[PDB]
């Protein structure tokens, strides 16, 4: 499903 948002996109 979803994964933890990182510090850069």
């Amino acid at each position, epitope marked *: 499903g*979803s994964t933890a948002p990182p510090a850069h996109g």
Partner: antibody, heavy 116, light 110 residues
Framework: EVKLLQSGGGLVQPGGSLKLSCAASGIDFSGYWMSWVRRAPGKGLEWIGEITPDSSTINYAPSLKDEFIISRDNAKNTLYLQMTKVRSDDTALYYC?????????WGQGTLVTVSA | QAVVTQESALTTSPGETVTLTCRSSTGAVTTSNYANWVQEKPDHLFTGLIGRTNNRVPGVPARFSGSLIGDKAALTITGAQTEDEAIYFCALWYSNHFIFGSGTKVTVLK
């Protein structure tokens, strides 16, 4: 109740090789970005690299991209960092971080001392 | 190689507001740089505060706010407290890597 346990490190002679481990418990490790940073004595924080949840793309800092190799085993809930052919200025406190809108969860940090 | 710059140190009093800046050498700091702010308290106690310019890691008090002030990224501690006395590091995303700043030694007068 999130804990990142680090192990490895210690004294290493110049030109040696070391491999640090970071075992995550309390989060769905498989779905978390991971990164390695280090704090040298007298220096600031230095970003080593980062690794996707699936290891699709791995990003190292351009300066030290040839010294370190980042890897992970989602099955074991463990993150690894292997430094090969270290130098004297690699002595520092190496920290294991997981991204969550930032450098959310940290490990206790393992000290690596490089000296002949 | 680009260089990230922050104030050498700052000094404030409990209750006041403080603003730390973070300047990129490549040009004006943009939202595409995804500014990050990390805090080191005594005894190598690192705790993340803000990422992606303004998103703060969950569970961090609201007095820490990330923004963009002109050409630099900014971390503003409004209503600072003694517990906020630490070293604040800045990180700027340069397409494929992070570059950490020298760090600002923020002092809150005990």
């Amino acid at each position: 109740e999130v804990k990142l346990l680090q192990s490895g490190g210690g004294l290493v002679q110049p030109g040696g090789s070391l491999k640090l481990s970071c075992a995550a418990s309390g989060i769905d490790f498989s779905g978390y970005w991971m990164s390695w940073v280090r704090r040298a004595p007298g220096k600031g924080l230095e970003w080593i690299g980062e690794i996707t949840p699936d290891s699709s793309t791995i990003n190292y800092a351009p300066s030290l991209k040839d010294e370190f190799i980042i890897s992970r085993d989602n099955a074991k809930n463990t993150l690894y960092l292997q430094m090969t052919k270290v130098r004297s200025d690699d002595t520092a406190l190496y920290y294991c971080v997981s991204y969550y809108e930032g450098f959310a969860y940290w490990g206790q940090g393992t000290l690596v001392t490089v000296s002949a | 190689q680009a260089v990230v710059t922050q104030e050498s140190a700052l000094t404030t009093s409990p209750g006041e507001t403080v603003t730390l800046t973070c300047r990129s050498s490549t040009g004006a700091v943009t939202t595409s740089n995804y500014a990050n702010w990390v805090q080191e308290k005594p005894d190598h106690l690192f705790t993340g505060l803000i990422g992606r310019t303004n998103n703060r890691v969950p569970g961090v008090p609201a007095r820490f706010s990330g923004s963009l002030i002109g050409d630099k990224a900014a971390l503003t501690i409004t209503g600072a407290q003694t517990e906020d006395e630490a070293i604040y590091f800045c990180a700027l995303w340069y397409s494929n890597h992070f570059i950490f700043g020298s760090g600002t030694k923020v002092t809150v007068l005990k």
